[PDB]
């Protein structure tokens, strides 16, 4: 439905559900796929890095907001930079005033209000970027998925990208696996490699694609690349 | 907060004139018929009140207000827009004059400021023009008696005798034949009662007719005389009971 | 609350407690009826209220009951059919008595506003007692 009703974020549908919310989800499927999970000890995010040609450098989907936190971008580039810089100030503002690191559960609530400001008012581009926010606090590991509508839901693991149903199905077989695994990051990393391979069509299996970052009680958030991820691959 | 073109003042007619002016004069053309006459020794203005519900009180709605009592006013146009215009006209007349010269504002300067108010509605986008047609009747010591007609288009012109309303086309010919420059204020009051009656003949009494004239300064209307030099109010509103006294003698 | 109301209305009934039965009737109608008097909820009118007329009949003067029957339809009520049902009861005892009650049958027509003025959409009761008034004028 081009123009007419629902052509603007303010105009509603005759059913009452704005189609611009559903159209924003299609931007995630056009981007790269990102698979992630967590446990009672660590959390692993597996992001796919594509490019144009062999000479094109693979774009890193994982952006580091905080020392103890991390995220990934499966959506549009410009919409994340505004949110990544906004969440970057919130981590320092909470450390300057409240002295406490930004909570993953509290980050999704403030991020939920940022996405509506474009749909609530006129103009601007709404935020449809898929965001998987992890972190480690005194409450344990947490992974909160960010939907293009602005809703935030915590899961043991999920995937966002093209044909994400394949990776979500593998998490059903392993639903009783990675949860019971504690203190063993080796099995948590291997679970993310086989999860993304089910959704992919097997284009390039090399180490310049999969980007694995882990955070936990001992090792903080660290982005592994090159020979670091070449051990499992 | 600005939304796109919402200030757009693009509307124009193919003839080149503003379309908002023609639609404003069209609504006033169907409205109640007012009038006014500038005589030698005085100025008379008259209009018919609004009936609407039979239980409505005529004392609530006043089609003749008071700015400063050197000048009268009457409107056949928008009812609500008159209250907003008078509120803004006084604040402009007080700030630009009374907060400087601290006296009664002159007629020529006051009309020029009222014309700007109608222009600011047309100049500022998104706001509809004022659909009021104002007759500004006042008496000063320089120009003497002055009767001005402020159209909703934003321009003003002087008139010896003029009328605005449904019978404005017919009353324009009546004022030429019946009224002459040699007629004085008393002669103009009788014509104002006959011309206004020819519009709506349903009720000719003073309850539906609001008559006001600007005469000589009355010391009783000011409420205080300590200074023989200070002039009293030149504007005097006639009571509906006094109107019926002239109807029986007419 | 229905079966519990008829038990409380029949307690000040037997022996009537002299003429105090009038104070044990209208006062109970004020305390009660704040719920009932909707459609089928009447525990008094057409049932208990009809027995009040028969209790005062052939006992005291009819001038007091004509004032009591008027106030029943004067204030609120629900449907005059139950009140018109009691009018036939009043005319029943007056017909079997007569004697000094001959002029009473005329007084009931004028005193009761249901027969004189309009109340509900059924006026048939007004015409039924009208024929009885014509028979009195013929005598």
């Amino acid at each position: 439905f081009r123009n007419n009703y629902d052509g603007d974020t303010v105009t509603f549908s005759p059913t009452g559900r704005l189609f611009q919310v559903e159209y924003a989800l299609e931007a995630i499927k056009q981007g790269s796929v990102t698979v992630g999970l967590r446990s009672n000890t660590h959390a692993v995010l597996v992001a796919l890095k594509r490019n144009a040609d062999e000479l094109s450098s693979y774009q890193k989907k994982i952006i580091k907001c905080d020392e103890h936190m991390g995220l990934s971008l499966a959506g549009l580039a410009p919409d994340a930079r505004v949110l990544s810089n906004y969440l970057r100030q919130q981590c320092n503002y909470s450390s300057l005033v409240f002295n406490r690191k930004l909570a993953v559960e509290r980050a999704g609530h403030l991020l939920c209000d940022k996405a509506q400001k474009n749909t609530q008012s006129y103009g601007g581009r709404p935020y449809g970027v898929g965001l998987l926010i992890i972190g480690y606090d005194k409450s344990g590991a947490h992974l909160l998925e960010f939907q293009p509508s602005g809703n935030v839901t915590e899961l043991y693991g999920t995937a966002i990208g093209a044909r994400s149903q394949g990776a979500k199905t593998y998490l059903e077989r392993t639903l009783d696996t990675f949860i019971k695994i504690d203190g063993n990051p080796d099995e948590l990393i291997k679970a993310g490699v086989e999860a993304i391979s089910q959704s992919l069509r097997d284009e390039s299996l090399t180490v310049d694609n999969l980007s694995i970052a882990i955070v936990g009680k001992d090792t903080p958030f660290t982005i592994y690349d090159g020979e670091a991820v070449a051990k499992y691959i | 907060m600005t939304d796109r073109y919402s200030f757009s003042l693009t509307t124009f007619s193919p003839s080149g004139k503003l379309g908002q002016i023609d639609y404003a004069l069209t609504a006033v053309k169907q409205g109640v018929t007012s009038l006014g006459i500038k005589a030698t020794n005085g100025v008379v203005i008259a209009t018919e009140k609004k009936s609407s519900s039979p239980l409505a009180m005529s004392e609530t709605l006043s089609k003749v207000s008071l700015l400063t009592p050197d000048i009268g006013a009457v409107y056949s146009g928008m009812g609500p827009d008159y209250r907003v215009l008078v509120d803004k006209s006084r604040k402009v007349a007080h700030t630009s004059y009374k907060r400087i010269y601290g006296e009664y504002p002159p007629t020529k300067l006051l009309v020029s400021e009222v014309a700007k108010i109608m222009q600011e509605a047309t100049q500022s986008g998104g706001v509809r023009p004022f659909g009021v047609s104002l007759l500004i009747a006042g008496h000063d010591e320089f120009n003497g008696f002055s009767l001005y007609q402020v159209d909703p288009s934003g321009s003003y012109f002087p008139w010896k005798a003029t009328a605005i309303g449904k019978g404005s086309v017919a009353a324009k010919t009546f004022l030429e034949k019946r009224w002459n420059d040699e007629l004085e204020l008393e002669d103009a009051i009788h014509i104002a009662l006959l011309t206004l009656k020819e519009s709506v003949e349903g009720e000719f009494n003073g309850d539906t007719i609001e008559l006001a004239i600007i005469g000589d300064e009355n010391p009783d209307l000011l409420g205080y005389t300590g200074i023989p030099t200070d002039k009293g109010p030149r504007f005097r509103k006639l009571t509906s009971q006094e109107i019926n006294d002239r109807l029986e003698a007419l | 609350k229905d079966y519990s109301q008829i038990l409380k209305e029949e307690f000040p009934k037997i022996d009537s407690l002299a003429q105090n039965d009038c104070n044990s009737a209208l006062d109970q109608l004020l305390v009660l009826e704040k719920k009932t008097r909707q459609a089928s909820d009447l525990a008094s009118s057409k049932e208990v209220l009809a027995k009040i007329v028969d209790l005062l009949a052939s006992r005291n003067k009819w001038d007091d009951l004509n004032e009591q029957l008027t106030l029943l339809s004067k204030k609120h009520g629900q449907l005059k059919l139950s009140i018109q049902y009691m009018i036939q009861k009043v005319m029943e005892y007056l017909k079997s008595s007569k004697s000094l009650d001959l002029n009473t049958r005329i007084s009931v027509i004028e005193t009761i506003r249901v027969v004189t003025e309009n109340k509900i959409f059924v006026e048939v009761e007004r015409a039924r007692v009208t024929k009885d008034l014509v028979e009195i004028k013929k005598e």
Binding site: - | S6, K50, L55, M57, R83, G126, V127 | -
Partner: protein, 241 residues
């Protein structure tokens, strides 16, 4: 066409949006009756009865703006509370700049202009409600000013709203012609309230209980609203006649 959606003038020189402001006034279909007595002002408005899941006490079309001042609104209820807060704000700020009780004629002027500013603005939409202000003035006594949603205000002897307003206006018009006075006899404000209920039932043809109506009362130096027991007490004396 587009000429109906534009704020500026139409090809007929008459705004359609001003007419559409009265379309929402008939949504509730409430018939309000308010008359001007001698020392008092009686205001009666219909209270719609919802199902058992709602509180009929919280439902009211009459709100207290200030001392002796009251307002009944016939139209959208959610649009009424937004307009009610505007009248309450102008009532308290008026006393801080002056210090005397705000008259009803002036309160009808402020709310008319503010509702008229919405007509001129291209963003803010006009209020689709009906503003009827009632109070007892010191000099002018009881007065009722009904403010139109487009900024017009005029006084009425007996105001009427809703689709049945023709029954209320006509029945109360002939009543004022026989007495030839706009006021009502029996200076005591107790029976004046009961006089408006009988004229309302005979005009509407349906007798309403205490839960089907709400009765506002405006007295000298006091303003209140009759409760369920006070409204029921009024029907008792009316029933005896």
């Amino acid at each position: 066409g587009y000429d109906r959606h534009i704020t500026i003038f139409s090809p007929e020189g008459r705004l359609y949006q001003v007419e559409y402001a009265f379309k929402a006034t008939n949504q509730t279909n409430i018939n309000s009756l308010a008359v001007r007595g001698k020392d008092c002002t009686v205001v009666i408005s219909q209270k719609k009865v919802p199902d058992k899941l709602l509180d009929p006490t919280t439902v009211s079309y009459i709100f207290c703006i200030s001392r002796t001042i009251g307002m009944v609104v016939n139209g959208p209820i959610p649009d009424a509370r937004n307009a009610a807060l505007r009248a309450k704000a102008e009532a308290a700020e008026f006393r801080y700049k002056y210090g005397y009780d705000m008259p009803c004629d002036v309160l009808a002027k402020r709310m008319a202009n503010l509702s008229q500013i919405y007509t001129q603005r291209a963003y803010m939409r006009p209020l689709g409600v009906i503003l009827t202000f009632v109070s007892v003035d010191e000099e002018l006594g009881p007065s009722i000013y009904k403010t139109d949603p487009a900024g017009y205000y005029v006084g009425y002897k007996a105001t009427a709203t809703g689709p049945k307003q023709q029954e209320i206006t006509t029945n109360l018009e002939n009543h004022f012609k026989k007495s030839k006075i706009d006021h009502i006899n029996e200076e005591s404000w107790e029976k004046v309230v009961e006089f408006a209920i009988t004229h309302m039932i005979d005009a509407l043809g349906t007798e309403f209980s205490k839960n089907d109506l709400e009765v506002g009362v405006a007295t000298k130096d006091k303003f209140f609203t009759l409760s369920a027991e006070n409204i029921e007490e009024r029907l008792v004396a009316i029933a005896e006649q």
